[PDB]
Design a protein that fits this description.
The structure is cut from a larger assembly and holds 4 copies of chain A.
Chain A lengths: L3 H19 L12 H6 L3 H5 L1
The complex binds 2-acetamido-2-deoxy-beta-D-glucopyranose (7 copies).
Chain lengths: 49, 99, 50, 285
Amino acid sequence: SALGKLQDVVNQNAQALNTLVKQLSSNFGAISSVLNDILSRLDPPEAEV
Amino acid sequence: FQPTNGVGYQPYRVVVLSFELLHAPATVCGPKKSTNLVKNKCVNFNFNGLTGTGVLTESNKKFLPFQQFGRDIADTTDAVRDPQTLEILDITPCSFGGV
Amino acid sequence: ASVYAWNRKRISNCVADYSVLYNSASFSTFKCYGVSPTKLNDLCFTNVYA
Amino acid sequence: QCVNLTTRTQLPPAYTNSFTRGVYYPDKVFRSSVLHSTQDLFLPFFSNVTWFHAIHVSGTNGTKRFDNPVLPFNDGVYFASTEKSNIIRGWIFGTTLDSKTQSLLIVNNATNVVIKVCEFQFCNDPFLGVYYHKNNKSWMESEFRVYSSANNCTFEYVSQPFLMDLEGKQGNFKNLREFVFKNIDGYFKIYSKHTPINLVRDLPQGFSALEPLVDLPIGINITRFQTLLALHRSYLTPGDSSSGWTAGAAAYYVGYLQPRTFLLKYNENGTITDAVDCALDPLSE
Ligand SMILES: *[C@@H]1O[C@H](CO)[C@@H](O)[C@H](O)[C@H]1NC(C)=O
Ligand SMILES: *[C@@H]1O[C@H](CO)[C@@H](O)[C@H](O)[C@H]1NC(C)=O
Ligand SMILES: *[C@@H]1O[C@H](CO)[C@@H](O)[C@H](O)[C@H]1NC(C)=O
Ligand SMILES: *[C@@H]1O[C@H](CO)[C@@H](O)[C@H](O)[C@H]1NC(C)=O
Ligand SMILES: *[C@@H]1O[C@H](CO)[C@@H](O)[C@H](O)[C@H]1NC(C)=O
Ligand SMILES: *[C@@H]1O[C@H](CO)[C@@H](O)[C@H](O)[C@H]1NC(C)=O
Ligand SMILES: *[C@@H]1O[C@H](CO)[C@@H](O)[C@H](O)[C@H]1NC(C)=O
C-alpha cells in the first residue's frame, strides 16, 4: 500500500468506464432499452419517441 | 357398405382436426430452418432469439452442461453455444476505428 | 370409430409438420376454415384435437 | 382405496436452523470470476425451518410419528430430505385436492417417474405401500392408494424404468437431496442436487449450488402441497389396513423462499463456490 494514488486513478477510470457501459441498459422513461425491438414491436411514432 | 352402390354411398373417413389457444404456454408448433455455419466473418447471427454483429471465432471457454449463453464483467454477449453441435463460439466485433 | 362414438386424439408436446398433409395425393377434401394452411409453419398452438 | 390411518399421537414439531443453504443458479448465463449481484427468490440465511419427524423406535410407546401435513405454497419450498431407505418417494402438488382443480402429480414409483397432471380425488392421508416377505426377502411396492378417481387430463411425462435399492438399511443417513420448487409465469421450474452425508441429526453446514432440472409448462395455481412418504408394512406389525403399519426412519426439511438480494461469486469455471446475503448483518450489507 505505497503507490496509492497511481492505483486510485486507474480504479476511478475503470469505474467511470464501467458506469458509462452500464448506462446503456436503462429505460430512461421508455418501454425498453433495445432499439430494434422498440422499432419492430411498436408503431412508428411511439418508436421514434 | 355394400360394394355395389354409387359414389354417394361409400365410406368417407373424415378428420376433424381443430386448433385452439389456451392460457398455458404453447408446446406444439411448426418446424424451423437453419443456415450454414459461416465463421471468421462479421455477419448477423440469430441462434435462439438474440441478435448482434461480429465474427464467430472458436474459443476455449468451457460452459456448463445446462448453460447456453455467456457474458463478462460488462454484462454483454460474448460467447453463445451453437444449438446443433456442442461447440462454444466467441463473439467479438470486427475492425472499427478512425482514419 | 363410429359416427356416434367419435374418439378424440388430443396430442401435444410435439413438432407438427403440416407440410405432409396438403402435399399428398390421397385425400378428397382439404377445405380449411380460416387457418392459412400454407402459413401453419409459423403459428404455435397449445392442443391439437383430432 | 382411501384409508384413514390410526395410532398416531400428536407432538409439537421442532425447528432446525439452515446454515447457508438454498442458493441456486438464477439463469443460464456464463460468468467467470465475476462478483455478480442478482435479486430473486432465495432462502434467508440463519433462518430456522420446520423439522418433520418420521421414525418408529421401540422406545416410542405407540406414538408412530408419521407426519405429512398439507403445507402451504406461497412462493417456494426448499425441500431437503436426509433419507437412507428411499422414504420420500414423490409429491402431490396441487391447488384444491378435491377433484375440482388439476394437481401436479410427481411420483417416482417402483418402475420410473410419472409426472402426471390430471384432476384426481386425493384421500386424507396419501402414502405408498411396500410389503416385506419372510420367504424370499424381497421388498415389493404393492399399495398405490394415492388417488381414487381420474378425469380429463393434460400434458403428462414418463421416463425409462429402473430399480432402486428398497432395503431397510441400519445406521446413520447417507444421502442428501435438495430441491427448489418455484412456479412463475406458468413455469414450474425444479432444481435438484445430490450430495453425500454422514450425519444422524439436524441439517449440517455447507454450501451447494442447485442446478435446473426440469421446466414443465403446466400453468397451474398451486398454493398448497403435501408430501408422499412410504411405510414398511411387514410380518412384524399385525392388524389390518388401518393399524399395523411401520414408518421406517427418515426426515425432510421444508422452507419458504422470500424476495431478497444476494451477492453471488462465480468461479473460474462457472460454478458458484460461495455467496453472501444483503441483510443478515451490517457486515453482510
Ligand atoms: C443434428 O444433426 C446433425 C446432422 O444432421 C448432427 O451432426 C448433430 O449432432 C445433430 N444435433 C443434435 C443435438 O443431435
Ligand atoms: C376419513 O375421515 C374423513 C373425515 O373424518 C372422511 O371424510 C373420510 O371419508 C374418511 N375416510 C374413509 C376411507 O372413510
Ligand atoms: C423458529 O421459527 C419460528 C417461525 O414460525 C419462530 O418461532 C422463530 O423464528 C424460530 N424459533 C426458534 C426458537 O428458533
Ligand atoms: C409404476 O407406474 C407405472 C406408470 O403408471 C405403471 O405402469 C407401473 O405398473 C407402476 N408400478 C408399480 C409397481 O405399481
Ligand atoms: C416372494 O414371496 C411372496 C410371498 O407369497 C410372493 O407373493 C412373491 O410372488 C414372491 N416373489 C418372488 C420373486 O418369488
Ligand atoms: C376437463 O373437464 C372439465 C369438466 O368437464 C372442464 O371444465 C375442463 O375445461 C376440461 N379441460 C381441462 C381441465 O383441461
Ligand atoms: C476448473 O476446470 C479446470 C479444467 O478441468 C480444472 O483443472 C480446475 O481444477 C477447475 N477448478 C475448480 C474445480 O475449482
